Enzyme design. Structure first.
Site, mmCIF file in Angstrom:
data_model
loop_
_atom_site.group_PDB
_atom_site.id
_atom_site.type_symbol
_atom_site.label_atom_id
_atom_site.label_comp_id
_atom_site.label_asym_id
_atom_site.label_seq_id
_atom_site.Cartn_x
_atom_site.Cartn_y
_atom_site.Cartn_z
ATOM 1 C CG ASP A 11 -1.570 1.323 1.498
ATOM 2 O OD1 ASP A 11 -1.571 2.178 0.597
ATOM 3 O OD2 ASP A 11 -2.123 1.505 2.594
ATOM 4 C CE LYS A 72 -1.961 7.210 -2.541
ATOM 5 N NZ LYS A 72 -2.282 6.210 -1.486
ATOM 6 C CD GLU A 176 -5.051 3.895 -1.820
ATOM 7 O OE1 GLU A 176 -5.789 4.681 -1.188
ATOM 8 O OE2 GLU A 176 -4.033 4.270 -2.442
ATOM 9 C CG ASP A 200 -9.033 5.151 3.688
ATOM 10 O OD1 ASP A 200 -8.545 5.392 4.809
ATOM 11 O OD2 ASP A 200 -8.341 4.912 2.683
#
Ligand code: Q88
Ligand code: CL
Lengths: 382, 111
Positions: A11, A72, A176, A200
């Protein structure tokens, strides 16, 4: 030379990354050289060396300008992207334009160097590969790398390129929210199509995704959330509460003393985590400011009240996601908790109450669920 | 009223006192180098360059004392544990006095 090892799940997260391996009929999340099950997505450049992970995050105060994180946020994006323009204002490192593409600019061994976000992400991926190799005692080449469901073609390609640069054979790139659903075996449940909501809240972002699983096929129906919402916002509220408390009790403002604020913030981060398992957290800080000892406590109820609007606000994205997917809340079959902040009992209570007492999928560590699902997928593809 | 429970806390504090002594030795070496350059054979311009080379080490020292403070800050010592509370208070004050010396160094280099 080491024997060849199995395929891993990685991840690649905004703030922290996680690597898992499916072995002996179960997923094992792999601890790093410092014994941490998650590794900071940090890369630091010094006069003498390049640091990745905990080593890079641990010297951030000492070397803020050359310590890159949040790559990211920048991966696969054009320099002129609004997200790039808004985000850089908050970074202590330089972001430069190279023919329409963003690059991080740092000082490394006394020289000015620039890196594409995929080069920075490849350094984090190299570290994750090494973490896996150090635990397994075998060479690791194959891996499944996860990306957010909202990532575009450019953002997906740039992540795969980071994998390639890192010497990884990227078996597949999976979303994800899909990885979190796979971790809980939601695609293996018998019956008709199932509607899945992934909540999340972790890694400095809040992502709500709605998926449909039909005959083992995952379809992303909708995505919603807040890009900059996380544990830090909750932490700030505790910090502000304490500063105000110190002002009332001692008529002293500690907020201009960086070290006092840091000692308080560190104690608050710990106290918050304690409040997810206990109803009260105690704090004893000797000589916090001007020789004054700060001995105090905070109840779970006070922490909840301090964050009431932020906690309640997490449901707005859920309603927006349900609206976009054209679903009523009664049509959701499964609810999955991802991210460290989902451990907060009030957040679980608000979400369960919204879904009329429905039990949540929270047995897997929230911070590890995405790597867990990627590790399962990696074993399937082996 | 000395309890075996308190011995556990005093042992944690003694370990932290030893870690403080190791960082304090680094600060002592940094002070000797700073003094050496200031009272040395280098001309004024070459002296300022030699002093700014110590900047990384002072920042690492400051950070190490800050991490000790954060570790001490995790301790909870009941009021009955008088010896532990006194040792913790003395250790925090000792670290704070070392941090003030680090500040004196940091403000006198790279000016
Ligand atoms: N990662 C993380 N762990 C926790 C926890 N135990 N409680 C609250 N927020 C958290 N965030
Ligand atoms: Cl492990």
């Amino acid at each position: 030379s080491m024997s060849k090892g199995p395929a891993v799940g990685i991840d690649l997260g905004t703030t922290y990354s996680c690597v898992g391996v499916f072995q002996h009929g179960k997923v094992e999340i792999i601890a790093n050289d410092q014994g941490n099950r998650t590794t900071p997505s940090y890369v630091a450049f010094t006069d003498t060396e390049r640091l990745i992970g905990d080593a890079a995050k641990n010297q951030v105060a000492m070397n803020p300008t050359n310590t890159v994180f949040d790559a990211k946020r920048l991966i696969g994006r054009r320099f002129d992207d609004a997200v790039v323009q808004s985000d850089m204002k908050h970074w202590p490192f330089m972001v430069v334009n190279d023919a329409g593409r963003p690059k991080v600019q740092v000082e490394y061994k006394g020289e000015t160097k620039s890196f594409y976000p995929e080069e920075v992400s490849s350094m984090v991926l190299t570290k994750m590969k090494e973490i896996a190799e150090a635990y397994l005692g075998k060479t690791v080449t194959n891996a499944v790398v996860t990306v957010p469901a909202y990532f575009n073609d450019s953002q997906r390609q740039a992540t795969k390129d980071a994998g390639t640069i890192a010497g990884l054979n990227v078996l597949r790139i999976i979303n994800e929210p899909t990885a979190a659903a796979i971790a809980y075996g939601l695609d293996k449940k018998v019956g008709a199509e199932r509607n899945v909501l992934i909540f999340d809240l972790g890694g400095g972002t809040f992502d709500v995704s709605i998926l449909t699983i039909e005959d083992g096929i995952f379809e992303v129906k909708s995505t919603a959330g807040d890009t900059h919402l996380g544990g830090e916002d909750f932490d700030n509220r505790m910090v502000n509460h304490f500063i105000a408390e110190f002002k009332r009790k001692h008529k002293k403002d500690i907020s201009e003393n960086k070290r006092a604020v840091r000692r308080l913030r560190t104690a608050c981060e710990r106290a918050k985590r304690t409040l997810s398992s206990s109803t009260q957290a105690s704090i004893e800080i000797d000589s916090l400011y001007e020789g004054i000892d700060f001995y105090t406590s905070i109840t779970r109820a006070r922490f909840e009240e301090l964050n009431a609007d932020l906690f309640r606000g997490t449901l707005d994205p859920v309603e927006k996601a349900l609206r976009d997917a054209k679903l009523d809340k009664s049509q959701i079959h499964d609810i999955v908790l991802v991210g460290g902040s989902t451990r907060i009992p009030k957040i679980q209570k608000l979400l369960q109450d919204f879904f009329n007492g429905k039990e949540l999928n929270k047995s897997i560590n929230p911070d590890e669920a995405v790597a867990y699902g990627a590790a399962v997928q990696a074993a399937i593809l082996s | 009223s000395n309890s075996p429970q308190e011995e556990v806390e005093l042992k944690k504090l003694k370990h932290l006192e030893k870690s403080v002594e190791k960082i304090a030795d680094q600060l002592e070496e940094l002070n000797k180098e700073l003094t050496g350059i200031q009272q040395g054979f280098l001309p004024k311009d070459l002296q300022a360059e030699a002093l700014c080379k110590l900047d990384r080490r002072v920042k690492a020292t400051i950070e190490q004392f800050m991490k000790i403070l954060e570790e001490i800050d995790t301790l909870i010592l009941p009021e009955n544990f008088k010896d532990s509370r006194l040792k913790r208070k003395g250790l925090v004050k000792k670290v704070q006095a070392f941090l003030a010396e680090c500040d004196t160094v940091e403000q006198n280099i790279c000016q």
